[PDB]
Structure formats: C-alpha cells, structure tokens
Amino acid sequence: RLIYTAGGYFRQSLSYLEAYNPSDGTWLRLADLQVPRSGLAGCVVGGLLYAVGGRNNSPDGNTDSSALDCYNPMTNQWSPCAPMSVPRNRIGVGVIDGHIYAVGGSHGCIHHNSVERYEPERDEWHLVAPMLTRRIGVGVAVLNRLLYAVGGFDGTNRLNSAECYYPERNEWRMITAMNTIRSGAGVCVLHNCIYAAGGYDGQDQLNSVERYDVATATWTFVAPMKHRRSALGITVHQGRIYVLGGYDGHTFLDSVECYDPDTDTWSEVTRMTSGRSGVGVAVT
Numbered sequence: 001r002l003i004y005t006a007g008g009y010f011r012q013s014l015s016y017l018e019a020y021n022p023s024d025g026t027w028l029r030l031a032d033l034q035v036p037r038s039g040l041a042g043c044v045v046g047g048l049l050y051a052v053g054g055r056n057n058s059p060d061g062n063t064d065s066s067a068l069d070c071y072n073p074m075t076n077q078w079s080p081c082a083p084m085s086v087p088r089n090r091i092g093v094g095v096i097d098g099h100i101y102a103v104g105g106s107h108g109c110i111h112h113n114s115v116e117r118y119e120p121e122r123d124e125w126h127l128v129a130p131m132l133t134r135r136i137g138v139g140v141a142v143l144n145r146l147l148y149a150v151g152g153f154d155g156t157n158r159l160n161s162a163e164c165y166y167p168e169r170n171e172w173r174m175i176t177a178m179n180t181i182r183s184g185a186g187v188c189v190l191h192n193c194i195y196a197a198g199g200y201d202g203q204d205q206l207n208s209v210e211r212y213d214v215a216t217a218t219w220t221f222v223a224p225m226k227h228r229r230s231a232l233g234i235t236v237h238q239g240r241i242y243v244l245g246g247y248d249g250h251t252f253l254d255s256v257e258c259y260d261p262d263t264d265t266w267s268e269v270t271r272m273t274s275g276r277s278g279v280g281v282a283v284t
C-alpha cells in the first residue's frame with residue numbers, strides 16, 4: 001500500500017498531493033487539490049482518499065474551510081463531497097465502521113467542541129454529541145472501534161487531555177491526561193497502543209513520543225524523534241509509524257521519520273520534495 005500527503009503549508013497553503021512506497025522509497029506526483037489548504041486531515045474509506053477540513057489560501061477576509069473532498073487513485077480524479085456543518089481548521093479525524101468523524105478544529109476565533117459524522121453511502125454529515133473540551137490542533141486516532149481525541153488547545157490552555165468517544169452510547173469520557181502538553185501533535189494507533197508524537201507545549205517544540213495502553217491507563221514514553229516538530233502528518237504502514245512534515249518554530253521540515261516498535265528506534269527513510277506543515281495523511 002502507498003502512503004499519501006495532501007495539502008500542506010509553506011508560507012502559503014499548498015494544493016499538492018504526493019505518494020510514497022516504503023518497498024522502493026520513491027515519490028510520485030499526483031493530481032493537485034482543486035483548492036489549496038493546510039491545517040487539514042485526510043483518511044481513506046473504501047479505497048478512496050478523503051481530504052477533510054483545513055484553511056483556504058485566499059488570503060482575504062476570513063476563510064477557514066468546511067470542505068470535504070474525495071480522490072480516486074485509480075482514476076486520479078478529485079471530487080467534491082458534502083461540506084461539513086461548520087469550518088474546521090486544525091482538525092483531526094478517525095474512521096469507525098466506514099464513517100468519517102470530523103472532530104474539533106477552529107473557525108475564526110471559535111474553537112470547536114462540536115463533532116460530526118459522514119456517511120459515504122448517503123454523502124451527508126450528522127452533528128453528533130460534542131466533546132467535553134474545545135480542541136484545535138487535535139490528534140484523533142481510533143483504537144478498537146473507539147475514537148480518542150487526544151491533546152489540543154481550547155482557546156486559552158494548551159492541553160494534555162485525551163478524552164475518548166463511545167459510538168454505541170454516543171458520549172465522551174475524560175480519560176487519563178498526557179505527561180507532556182501537546183498542541184499540534186500527530187496521533188495514529190498501532191498494536192493496541194495510541195501514540196502522541198511531537199507537538200508544541202510553550203517554549204519548546206517537542207521531539208518526545210509517548211504511548212497509551214488502555215487498561216493500565218498510563219502514558220509511557222517511547223524513543224523520541226530526531227527532529228522536533230508540531231503540525232506533522234502521521235500514519236502507519238506495515239507495523240511501523242511514518243511522520244511526514246513538521247513545524248519546528250523556525251523552519252518547515254521536509255523530513256520523514258519511521259518508528260520501528262520492534263526495536264524502539266527512529267530512522268529517517270527519505271525526504272519530501274518541499275518541506276511543509278499541515279498535511280492530511282492516509283494509506284491505501
């Protein structure tokens with residue numbers, strides 16, 4: 001399977017889309033986004049890539065995006081899908097049972113607690129029960145058919161909270177907080193363990209990575225990345241974690257690091273074409 005990157009920001013939101021294969025280590029340029037947008041998330045359902053939320057390039061008035069769009073790698077064609085109820089810049093996303101869950105994100109000065117679910121069958125959104133916190137820069141990631149809305153910023157406090165959602169009950173549960181504060185962290189599940197790689201805390205942009213096992217309900221640290229970064233893209237391919245892009249305060253990273261859980265070691269496997277922050281990453 002190929003890993004992708006959609007959108008991104010480099011002094012300007014980027015309309016790019018690219019693809020990568022770990023078996024040969026090569027980059028493949030693909031059909032550019034119809035509207036450029038950073039601060040967005042991406043995912044795949046039914047072998048079609050999706051590019052949820054973000055922020056338009058403009059640059060005029062106010063343009064946070066409530067925009068859902070779908071890509072077909074076989075035909076290489078972008079379609080426009082039903083737009084979310086509210087704009088969501090700095091958004092996370094997760095998928096349960098073939099539905100797409102938009103969680104949080106900013107719209108102007110408003111930092112959303114609201115959440116909405118997308119059915120591809122029908123092509124429409126349904127506003128679900130909101131989170132207990134407000135969260136922009138929020139890492140979403142799914143563990144055994146439950147949605148963990150990790151970290152974020154609420155409008156005044158950068159947070160270490162990492163509440164969880166129960167689709168069967170339709171309610172949110174405030175579980176155990178992270179050791180390190182993380183706004184703009186990247187989160188993706190692997191082997192019954194949620195991971196929180198990098199982000200921004202206050203002074204420092206972080207390189208530290210920590211891992212959440214459910215029962216014990218504790219955040220055990222893991223080997224940190226080489227480069228410190230928030231706003232990174234993140235995903236999993238073949239029992240390893242791949243961390244694309246970043247914003248280290250002073251530069252936009254073109255690095256791509258790979259975490260091997262089998263050894264607890266980070267290793268760079270390549271470099272992107274042009275370094276950017278705020279991509280939407282997925283795998284098919």
Ligand SMILES: NC(=O)[C@H]1CC[C@H]1C(=O)N1CCc2c(OCCO)cccc2[C@H]1CN1C(=O)c2ccccc2C1=O
Nearest residue numbers: 009038039040041055090091137184231247277278279
């Ligand atoms: N779409 C946006 O909001 C864009 C507005 C510029 C860019 C932006 O602010 N971003 C990039 C995206 C992103 C994010 O992405 C969500 C992935 O789903 C999650 C959390 C934070 C960010 C910030 C990180 N950041 C920068 O790139 C940057 C550049 C220059 C000065 C300050 C910053 C700065 O703070």
